[PDB]
Amino acid sequence: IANPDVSSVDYQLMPPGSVIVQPDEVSAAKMLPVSGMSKHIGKTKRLVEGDGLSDYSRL
Amino acid sequence: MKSVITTTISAADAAGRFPSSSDLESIQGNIQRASARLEAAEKLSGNHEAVVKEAGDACFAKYSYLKNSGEAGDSQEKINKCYRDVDHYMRLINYSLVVGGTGPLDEWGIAGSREVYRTLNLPGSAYIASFTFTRDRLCVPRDMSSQAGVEFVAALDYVINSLS
Amino acid sequence: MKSVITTTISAADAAGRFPSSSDLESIQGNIQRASARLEAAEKLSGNHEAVVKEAGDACFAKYSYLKNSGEAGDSQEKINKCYRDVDHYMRLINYSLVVGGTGPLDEWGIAGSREVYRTLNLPGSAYIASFTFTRDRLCVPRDMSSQAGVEFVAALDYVINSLS
Amino acid sequence: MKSVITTTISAADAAGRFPSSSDLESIQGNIQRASARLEAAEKLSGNHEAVVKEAGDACFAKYSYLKNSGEAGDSQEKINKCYRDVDHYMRLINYSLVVGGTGPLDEWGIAGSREVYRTLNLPGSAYIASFTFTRDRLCVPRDMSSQAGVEFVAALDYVINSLS
Amino acid sequence: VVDPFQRKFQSIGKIGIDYSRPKKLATYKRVGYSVGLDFPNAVSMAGHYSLTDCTRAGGAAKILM
Amino acid sequence: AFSSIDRILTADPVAFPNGTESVIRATYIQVFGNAHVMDSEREELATAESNVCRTGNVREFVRAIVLSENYKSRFFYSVSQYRFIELMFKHILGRAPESRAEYAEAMAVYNTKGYEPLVSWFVDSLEYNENFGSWIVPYGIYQGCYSSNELFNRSVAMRLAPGCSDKGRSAMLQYCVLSGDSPNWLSISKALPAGTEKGTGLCIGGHWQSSQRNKQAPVKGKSKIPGGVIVTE
Amino acid sequence: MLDAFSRVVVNSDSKAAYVGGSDLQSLKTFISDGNKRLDAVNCIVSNASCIVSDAISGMICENPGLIAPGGNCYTNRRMAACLRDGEIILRYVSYALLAGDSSVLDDRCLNGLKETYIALGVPTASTSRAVSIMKAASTAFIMNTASGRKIEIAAGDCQALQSEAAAYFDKVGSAVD
Amino acid sequence: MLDAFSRVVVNSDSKAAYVGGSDLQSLKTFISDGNKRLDAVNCIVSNASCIVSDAISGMICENPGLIAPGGNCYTNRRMAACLRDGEIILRYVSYALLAGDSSVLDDRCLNGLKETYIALGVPTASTSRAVSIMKAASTAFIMNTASGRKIEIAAGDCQALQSEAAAYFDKVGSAVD
Amino acid sequence: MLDAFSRVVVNSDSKAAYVGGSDLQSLKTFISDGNKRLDAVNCIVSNASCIVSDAISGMICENPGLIAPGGNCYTNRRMAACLRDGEIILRYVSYALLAGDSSVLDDRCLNGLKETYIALGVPTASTSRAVSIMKAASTAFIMNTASGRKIEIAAGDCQALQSEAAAYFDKVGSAVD
Numbered sequence A: 001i002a003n004p005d006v007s008s009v010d011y012q013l014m015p016p017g018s019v020i021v022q023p024d025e026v027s028a029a030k031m032l033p034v035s036g037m038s039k040h041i042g043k044t045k046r047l048v049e050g051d052g053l054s055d056y057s058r059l
Numbered sequence B, C, D: 001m002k003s004v005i006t007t008t009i010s011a012a013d014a015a016g017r018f019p020s021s022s023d024l025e026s027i028q029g030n031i032q033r034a035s036a037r038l039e040a041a042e043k044l045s046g047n048h049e050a051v052v053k054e055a056g057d058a059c060f061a062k063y064s065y066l067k068n069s070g071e072a073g074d075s076q077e078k079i080n081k082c083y084r085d086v087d088h089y090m091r092l093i094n095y096s097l098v099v100g101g102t103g104p105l106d107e108w109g110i111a112g113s114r115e116v117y118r119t120l121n122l123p124g125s126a127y128i129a130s131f132t133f134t135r136d137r138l139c140v141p142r143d144m145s146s147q148a149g150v151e152f153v154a155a156l157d158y159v160i161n162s163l164s
Numbered sequence E: 001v002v003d004p005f006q007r008k009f010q011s012i013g014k015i016g017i018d019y020s021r022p023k024k025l026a027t028y029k030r031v032g033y034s035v036g037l038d039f040p041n042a043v044s045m046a047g048h049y050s051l052t053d054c055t056r057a058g059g060a061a062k063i064l065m
Numbered sequence F: 001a002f003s004s005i006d007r008i009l010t011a012d013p014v015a016f017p018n019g020t021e022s023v024i025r026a027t028y029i030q031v032f033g034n035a036h037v038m039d040s041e042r043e044e045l046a047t048a049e050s051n052v053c054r055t056g057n058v059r060e061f062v063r064a065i066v067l068s069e070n071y072k073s074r075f076f077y078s079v080s081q082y083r084f085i086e087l088m089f090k091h092i093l094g095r096a097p098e099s100r101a102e103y104a105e106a107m108a109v110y111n112t113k114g115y116e117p118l119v120s121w122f123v124d125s126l127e128y129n130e131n132f133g134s135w136i137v138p139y140g141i142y143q144g145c146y147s148s149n150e151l152f153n154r155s156v157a158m159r160l161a162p163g164c165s166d167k168g169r170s171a172m173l174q175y176c177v178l179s180g181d182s183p184n185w186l187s188i189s190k191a192l193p194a195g196t197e198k199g200t201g202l203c204i205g206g207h208w209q210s211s212q213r214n215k216q217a218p219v220k221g222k223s224k225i226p227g228g229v230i231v232t233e
Numbered sequence G, H, I: 001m002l003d004a005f006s007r008v009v010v011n012s013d014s015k016a017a018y019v020g021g022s023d024l025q026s027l028k029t030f031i032s033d034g035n036k037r038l039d040a041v042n043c044i045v046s047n048a049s050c051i052v053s054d055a056i057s058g059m060i061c062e063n064p065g066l067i068a069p070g071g072n073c074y075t076n077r078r079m080a081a082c083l084r085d086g087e088i089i090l091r092y093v094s095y096a097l098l099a100g101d102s103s104v105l106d107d108r109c110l111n112g113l114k115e116t117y118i119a120l121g122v123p124t125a126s127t128s129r130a131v132s133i134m135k136a137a138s139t140a141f142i143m144n145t146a147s148g149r150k151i152e153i154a155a156g157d158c159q160a161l162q163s164e165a166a167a168y169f170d171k172v173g174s175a176v177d
């Protein structure tokens, strides 16, 4: 669920270097195949193989 | 999809006339400048991934506020849509370099982009920051060639002048 | 007056768009084929008198009936109108070679010629006889050059196909 | 070949009796609905060419991927086989329309079709696109008698429900 | 609505309000603003300009006149 | 109004200020359909050609053509009034009637007065002035966000596919105007420009046929609340 | 309206990728072929009226029922529309030779032609015969093997290009049938 | 619409003679200059929106009565039409640089502009000021001496061509006044 | 639009021959029929609005469901369009009496009328009733046997022409049904 309600991280107050942005795949063709299933875009990312289990039960 | 061929065919067709020597001189010029355009298209198809990566990285390097509150790229997903969009723009620059007119770039990329961009709150200045970064990352003798490099600059400048 | 320049400027103007790279490639081809066209125009301006004289001489050499009864050139005056008309057509071939489209030849010579010719009982086949005589009297390396010679043939062929 | 009279003759024959008054009432209904069937047959034999032309044109209007590459209809010959097949189909609708049962349409067109369209990589959905175009586009009051239009639509629906 | 004559005589309005599609200069030079004159009282002012014209509406020259 | 196909696919408007011969020819093809005029008819229209070589009132050109016997002969003498009114819409405006009321308006302006008042009624429409004015040749317009959807369907269906020539064909919009049913999807589909993916709707198949929209069919609608579904009828 | 270039680009757009090496190699052969194409279009253009004249006159003389009273060439106006249509067909074939792709010929003229000649009552077989005569005449001019005109060009093989032009005429003649 | 070529031809038509030697010699210098004109038009086109922005913004900042209430720049729609007109002026100047003759600029845009801006109440001196700013900015791009962009070209003298472009802008600014 | 003359000419054109004797003989009977046709058209024209009034009023009074609420004569605008249509029908029948051939009536009005009245929901039987009343009224005026008007003409037999006008009205009434 993890949702903060009253919450804003400014990301303009940070020092000029320390805003880093990373894209999993830097391509057009591989972010979306012709068919619907996707591992990045849409709700289709929900249906990747793996990640079905959970490791937070250690608490 | 506008090119030399479609311009002179479209014009001589609009007159209802057989294609005279003028049209033949036009396509003569197309096959003169062709080798430069195809050279820059080959090299763009060579290293497009580093081009898009450096382009988007400088795009968030300038405007950091996008990944802050954001009414912008505010997830890894939207940054993936960012680098997808830069992939599309570079792919259309490749297409316009192969056709040799601004045809596919205008009819696929530029036409009606402004309603999408003002509707989905997407700022144009970020794209302009990306393209000006790539245009400053050009080389005179090093990466492409002098003359074809100029062709590439022209195409990218068209994008900027269509967006601002 | 149609040429490469007027076609692409007229087209870019019709779109309301700045002249892109495509127009620049078209005019690039115009300045490629330019030297050939101007060579043929210089040589035509050289010996046009002999060209027109041999042309009209072969024109009456084919159709003798014009100078017989005639409902045609039936005086020395009308034969002077004959050699005047061939002077005009060679001068418009010169102009179309300099412009490098069929512009001034079409708008000055071809446009509305058919009403004049069917009104004033002038057969077109006699003109066609004259121009086919000149086109058969061409030379491959001798008088002009190979490539420019081809240019000249094209212009004159246009006249014939506009008249038949 | 199934019709009213072949069903009742074959049924009484399987019984082992003379045809009683029930078979006579059946063939009485055959000669009641006869006039509407033959009217529909007359108009179908009237304009079969335009019907098949609209059928194939809408069939490739709906589907375009048939034209490209490996898929059928790519070359002119295969598309000629396409309009020939729809010619066969409307000719079988005319035949079953004259007979008044689905007999000749079943034994000549439907029986064993599935192995053939399955084996020869022929999609049936395109055929259904053709027939549903010829089914949707007709007016009973305008081009046919009220009963005839019903008969035609019925036969064509049989084709569709037998196809896929 | 407005009579076909009357529309020719009247005026051309501003763009963003009166007409969506922008207009060629030709139509500002030719139709535009169309005022005829009173009779001229003096020897000096008579033969220079025409008087009120009928079934014709000039534009942008009548401003200067 | 985005106007998706206005400049991207459809050729540009033939404005006046270029060469006159191209304006004259393009107006022949638009005003006429692909009429394919011959020597006699062009000689017969010479005075309008003169009036338009002189001043570029292409509005007055179209008026002068539609008043002439070459246009009157074909369309007003070989062709029946239903098709006459409809073609008149197509030749002059580029577009079809959007409703039965407007078709009744044009028919009424005919029957009260005559032919010339009708022609001046098309040429003097405010809609015609905003689309074309005095200086632009008629053409088919892709506005987007039209007043009626039926305006788009009938307009495209009556703007035929390249190489039109209404001299063979018969009137497709009379039952369509009076009934309010839009034309067949195939004719609409045939007339669209290239790259519009002509008629890749028409979901047909074992499942999801839904080939003809049916007016009388009852309306159903389901929404999902955390409890379950509300169906509103 | 799509040339060679636009065909490569649109196919690479459906494939969603950049244009690539092999497609650019075939397009280098296009540019490489070059001037052969230019001079070919010059040959088909600079004889075109005469091609239309010879072809339609041959069409009538092979099938004399067209000029028979009741045929579709029986009027002066029908004959003028006939010559006009043959001129237009040769015009769009010349456009398809400049472009290198038959998208212009498919979008302009070919789409809705059989329904037009069906609507007018024009016989389709006679049109395909006239198209075939323009095909043979046109390839005979394109190889410079005309029996009345032999113009000077530098020598060079052009089988490929002649097969291309014959492909366009066979597209038209197959399209009207 | 007349280029350099059509100017030579029309002048030789009024003279009623053939083309000759000296006129073709000057036209060889036109062709001889060649690309410099090409690359010049490329420089003015590939900066053009930015030229229009800077020039009109400079026009307002020099004369703040335009943006004052009651001025002709005071509204969004007036400002939009303002930017649109500056874009058109630079467009026709670029056409006049490709053609080499100002017949296109005289026939398209310059004909009937003074009476239009008189009819609308547009101040003419402010338009001539904006044209002058486009002139200085455009020649600064054409000599590659912009303070914000210095793109790579091979070296060569281009004074003549810059004087030509300055002649077209002085034609426009003299035309509105 | 074809008169009797154009029917003879078009039939002789399909026959591909000259005009001849017998067809011109029947056309001589047409021209001698002449002033009877002229005065007949004068009789049908100079009573025409009153014919339409009486015929449509008779149509309503024979079948009072038309004026019933929900019927197709129930409104003022429906009634006006009704009278307008009856006036047009009598107009084209008068044209068919001047021409002598029903090609004008077939090409103008009759072509596409059944599908129009089907598209509007107009009952066809009531229209055929109104056409029949215009037929009987019109022939009663054409024999000068009206019970309210007896105008002066020289006497003579006109059965043929009355049968012709009845053939046109039966063409219309058979056409709507």
Ligand SMILES: C=CC1=C(C)[C@@H](Cc2[nH]c(/C=C3N=C(/C=C4\NC(=O)[C@H](C)[C@H]4CC)C(C)=C\3CCC(=O)O)c(CCC(=O)O)c2C)NC1=O
Residues within 6 Å of the ligand: B056, B059, B066, B072, B073, B078, B079, B081, B082, B083, B085, B086, B088, B089, B108, B109, B116, B120, B122, B123, B126, B127, B130
């Ligand atoms: C054929 C060419 C072609 C393009 C060029 C793109 C252009 C484009 N981008 C978006 C859409 C988008 N584009 C971006 C990209 C951005 N994220 C940012 O932080 C930057 C400002 C910017 C990258 C530089 C984002 C974030 C969205 C989604 C916007 C949103 O939903 O809020 C959309 C709407 C549809 C969608 O959501 O995908 C379109 C049409 N699409 C195309 O079809």
Ligand SMILES: C=CC1=C(C)[C@@H](Cc2[nH]c(/C=C3N=C(/C=C4\NC(=O)[C@H](C)[C@H]4CC)C(C)=C\3CCC(=O)O)c(CCC(=O)O)c2C)NC1=O
Residues within 6 Å of the ligand: C059, C066, C072, C073, C074, C078, C079, C081, C082, C083, C085, C086, C088, C089, C108, C109, C116, C120, C122, C123, C126, C127
């Ligand atoms: C700008 C281009 C241009 C042309 C090409 C000519 C074409 C031309 N020729 C004539 C007119 C004429 N041209 C000829 C020529 C002919 N005599 C014959 O025996 C031959 C068939 C033929 C020469 C081959 C004659 C004889 C006349 C006069 C005809 C007459 O008055 O009967 C006229 C009418 C005006 C006149 O009388 O001069 C024109 C427009 N004029 C132009 O302005």
Ligand SMILES: C=CC1=C(C)[C@@H](Cc2[nH]c(/C=C3N=C(/C=C4\NC(=O)[C@H](C)[C@H]4CC)C(C)=C\3CCC(=O)O)c(CCC(=O)O)c2C)NC1=O
Residues within 6 Å of the ligand: D059, D066, D071, D072, D073, D074, D078, D079, D081, D082, D083, D085, D086, D088, D089, D108, D109, D116, D120, D122, D123, D126, D127
């Ligand atoms: C008596 C009824 C009767 C029929 C209904 C047909 C049905 C039929 N079609 C084909 C054969 C064929 N049918 C088609 C038709 C198609 N092309 C396409 O693009 C579309 C999917 C489809 C038209 C809508 C084609 C292309 C072939 C040849 C297939 C091939 O050889 O690859 C064959 C195999 C024999 C042959 O090659 O002709 C048969 C039996 N034949 C009959 O005797």
Ligand SMILES: C=CC1=C(C)[C@@H](Cc2[nH]c(/C=C3N=C(/C=C4\NC(=O)[C@H](C)[C@H]4CC)C(C)=C\3CCC(=O)O)c(CCC(=O)O)c2C)NC1=O
Residues within 6 Å of the ligand: D040, D043, D044, D045, D046, D047, D048, D050, D051, D054, D137, D138, D139, D140, D141, D142, D143, D144, F169, F170, F171, F172, F173, F175, F176, F181, F187
């Ligand atoms: C043997 C059986 C047989 C049929 C069932 C018809 C079916 C049919 N109808 C049309 C053609 C047509 N059919 C209609 C009919 C319609 N008008 C509308 O308002 C309604 C939607 C619909 C009546 C209910 C129209 C209007 C056309 C002409 C369409 C056009 O040209 O736009 C055509 C094309 C040829 C033509 O133009 O006539 C064909 C094959 N023809 C046949 O040979």
Ligand SMILES: C=CC1=C(C)[C@@H](Cc2[nH]c(/C=C3N=C(/C=C4\NC(=O)[C@H](C)[C@H]4CC)C(C)=C\3CCC(=O)O)c(CCC(=O)O)c2C)NC1=O
Residues within 6 Å of the ligand: E001, E002, E003, E004, E005, E006
């Ligand atoms: C929107 C506003 C608006 C107006 C104010 C009118 C103004 C106007 N009136 C007429 C036209 C006319 N106006 C009148 C009126 C007159 N008869 C006389 O005896 C008097 C002097 C005067 C009434 C006081 C007449 C008679 C005509 C016709 C003139 C003619 O044809 O001779 C016309 C020309 C078109 C036409 O014939 O109708 C116009 C534009 N029209 C408009 O659209």
Ligand SMILES: C=CC1=C(C)[C@@H](Cc2[nH]c(/C=C3N=C(/C=C4\NC(=O)[C@H](C)[C@H]4CC)C(C)=C\3CCC(=O)O)c(CCC(=O)O)c2C)NC1=O
Residues within 6 Å of the ligand: E040, E045, E046, E047, E048, E049, E050, E051, E052, E053, E054
């Ligand atoms: C002191 C007295 C005095 C007059 C009486 C006028 C008379 C007059 N009218 C015109 C000029 C003109 N006058 C008219 C008028 C006409 N338009 C037509 O359709 C009708 C025939 C007619 C109105 C009844 C027109 C149209 C012009 C311009 C003519 C042209 O330029 O073609 C001119 C030339 C100068 C100009 O263009 O204005 C003069 C002197 N001027 C004067 O100073």
Ligand SMILES: C=CC1=C(C)[C@@H](Cc2[nH]c(/C=C3N=C(/C=C4\NC(=O)[C@H](C)[C@H]4CC)C(C)=C\3CCC(=O)O)c(CCC(=O)O)c2C)NC1=O
Residues within 6 Å of the ligand: F003, F004, F005, F142, F143, F144, F145, F146, F147, F148, F149, F152, F196
């Ligand atoms: C008066 C009412 C009225 C409407 C309701 C619309 C309906 C409409 N939409 C389009 C046209 C269009 N409509 C859409 C919309 C779609 N994009 C998708 O991804 C979805 C399936 C869908 C939104 C839910 C698109 C994409 C086009 C352009 C289609 C194309 O050119 O390929 C057109 C053709 C003209 C044009 O290109 O604009 C029309 C008439 N127009 C009107 O005048």
Ligand SMILES: C=CC1=C(C)[C@@H](Cc2[nH]c(/C=C3N=C(/C=C4\NC(=O)[C@H](C)[C@H]4CC)C(C)=C\3CCC(=O)O)c(CCC(=O)O)c2C)NC1=O
Residues within 6 Å of the ligand: F034, F035, F036, F162, F163, F164, F165, F167, G066, G072, G073, G077, G078, G079, G081, G082, G083, G085, G086, G088, G089, G108, G109, G113, G116, G120, G122, G123, G126, G127, G130
């Ligand atoms: C853009 C492409 C394009 C075409 C390809 C043509 C096609 C075409 N041809 C005609 C029309 C015609 N086409 C012909 C031609 C023929 N005469 C014959 O003897 C032969 C069978 C055939 C030549 C081979 C004739 C005779 C007509 C007139 C038919 C008639 O009116 O009876 C028409 C109807 C309009 C008209 O009458 O001109 C059209 C659209 N038009 C176009 O716009």
Ligand SMILES: C=CC1=C(C)[C@@H](Cc2[nH]c(/C=C3N=C(/C=C4\NC(=O)[C@H](C)[C@H]4CC)C(C)=C\3CCC(=O)O)c(CCC(=O)O)c2C)NC1=O
Residues within 6 Å of the ligand: B021, B024, B025, B028, C033, C147, G035, G036, G038, G039, G040, G042, G043, G142, G143, G144, G153, G154, G155, G156, G157, G158
């Ligand atoms: C602007 C218009 C324009 C043209 C029309 C062409 C015309 C043209 N063709 C060639 C040159 C050539 N053209 C051909 C073509 C031919 N091969 C044959 O078998 C046939 C006879 C013929 C095609 C029908 C060949 C083979 C050459 C090379 C000749 C050689 O080097 O031997 C050349 C010399 C330069 C070169 O080698 O490319 C030129 C100017 N070029 C232009 O700029």
Ligand SMILES: C=CC1=C(C)[C@@H](Cc2[nH]c(/C=C3N=C(/C=C4\NC(=O)[C@H](C)[C@H]4CC)C(C)=C\3CCC(=O)O)c(CCC(=O)O)c2C)NC1=O
Residues within 6 Å of the ligand: B033, B146, B147, C024, C025, C028, H033, H034, H035, H036, H037, H038, H039, H040, H042, H142, H143, H144, H153, H154, H155, H156, H157, H158
């Ligand atoms: C199709 C597009 C197209 C272009 C955009 C031009 C680009 C172009 N410019 C030059 C070449 C040149 N370009 C310039 C231009 C100038 N140098 C200056 O210092 C000034 C800043 C600027 C004024 C305009 C000069 C001076 C040369 C070299 C001299 C010359 O070749 O005339 C060349 C010669 C080849 C080379 O240098 O490698 C080419 C192809 N030509 C084209 O075909």
Ligand SMILES: C=CC1=C(C)[C@@H](Cc2[nH]c(/C=C3N=C(/C=C4\NC(=O)[C@H](C)[C@H]4CC)C(C)=C\3CCC(=O)O)c(CCC(=O)O)c2C)NC1=O
Residues within 6 Å of the ligand: I034, I035, I036, I038, I039, I040, I042, I043, I141, I142, I143, I144, I153, I154, I155, I156, I157, I158
């Ligand atoms: C220019 C206008 C014009 C007309 C209107 C007619 C009028 C007219 N009708 C007749 C002559 C005639 N008109 C009729 C017509 C009639 N038959 C009857 O049964 C009805 C009463 C009536 C039709 C409604 C007949 C029958 C004759 C011949 C009378 C006779 O010879 O007895 C004559 C004498 C010359 C002739 O015999 O044709 C004239 C002048 N002629 C004209 O030139």
Ligand SMILES: CCC1=C(C)[C@@H](CC2=N/C(=C\c3[nH]c(C[C@@H]4NC(=O)C(C)=C4CC)c(C)c3CCC(=O)O)C(CCC(=O)O)=C2C)NC1=O
Residues within 6 Å of the ligand: G050, G051, G053, G054, G055, G056, G057, G058, G059, G061, G062, G132, G133, G136, G137, G140, G141, G145, G146, G147, G148, G149
């Ligand atoms: C009596 C009614 C009649 C005609 C009209 C002709 C028409 C005609 N020309 C042909 C074919 C044809 N036509 C030409 C063109 C033509 N030839 C030239 O050399 C020049 C300069 C030409 C235009 C002026 C060529 C070049 C050919 C190819 C044959 C050849 O080598 O000459 C063919 C052969 C068709 C085929 O091969 O299938 C025919 C039928 N024939 C007739 O029976």
Ligand SMILES: CCC1=C(C)[C@@H](CC2=N/C(=C\c3[nH]c(C[C@@H]4NC(=O)C(C)=C4CC)c(C)c3CCC(=O)O)C(CCC(=O)O)=C2C)NC1=O
Residues within 6 Å of the ligand: H050, H051, H054, H055, H057, H058, H061, H062, H132, H133, H136, H137, H140, H141, H145, H146, H147, H148, H149
């Ligand atoms: C405070 C309100 C204000 C402005 C807004 C500017 C506007 C302005 N720019 C000028 C002129 C001008 N402007 C530019 C374009 C500009 N410079 C570049 O290097 C790049 C990349 C540009 C676009 C981003 C150039 C290239 C010049 C020519 C001068 C130069 O060499 O920089 C001039 C001089 C005009 C003249 O010479 O007559 C003015 C007034 N001035 C003002 O007072």
Ligand SMILES: CCC1=C(C)[C@@H](CC2=N/C(=C\c3[nH]c(C[C@@H]4NC(=O)C(C)=C4CC)c(C)c3CCC(=O)O)C(CCC(=O)O)=C2C)NC1=O
Residues within 6 Å of the ligand: I050, I051, I054, I055, I057, I058, I059, I061, I062, I132, I133, I136, I137, I138, I140, I141, I145, I146, I147, I148, I149
């Ligand atoms: C109460 C609802 C009602 C009506 C309304 C009338 C309408 C009517 N008029 C008729 C027929 C009819 N109507 C006229 C025209 C008419 N007569 C004239 O003399 C003049 C000047 C006329 C126009 C003013 C004529 C000339 C006839 C032919 C009969 C006759 O000789 O009068 C007929 C006979 C139709 C037939 O023969 O089949 C009818 C039904 N009848 C009704 O019941």
